[PDB]
Amino acid sequence: LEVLLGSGDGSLVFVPSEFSVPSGEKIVFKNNAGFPHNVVFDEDEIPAGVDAVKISMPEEELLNAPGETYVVTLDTKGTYSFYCSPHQGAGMVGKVTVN
Numbered sequence: 001l002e003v004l005l006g007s008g009d010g011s012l013v014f015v016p017s018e019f020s021v022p023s024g025e026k027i028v029f030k031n032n033a034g035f036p037h038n039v040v041f042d043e044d045e046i047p048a049g050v051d052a053v054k055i056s057m058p059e060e061e062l063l064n065a066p067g068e069t070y071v072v073t074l075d076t077k078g079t080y081s082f083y084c085s086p087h088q089g090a091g092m093v094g095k096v097t098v099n
């Protein structure tokens, strides 16, 4: 599924934020507006089988320019919560449900 990082109008929201995807879905995250951004998964709020490092964009790096994309394949079923580190405090979080 294609997720827009920012609802165009600069607002620091993942579009969608809370959602569902089938097992093995290839999620794509694109810098729409309100960048810089990244997609880090909450190490607790993920199915243990998939270590966070396998789904989280390394904190060291970030989608700094507009248009830049990130991609991740969520194999195992479960609830995967994620956030944009530089805007975590601003509520730029989400929750994807691998059905």
Ligand SMILES: [Cu+2]
Residues within 6 Å of the ligand: 012, 034, 035, 036, 037, 038, 084, 085, 086, 087, 092
């Ligand atoms: Cu952000």
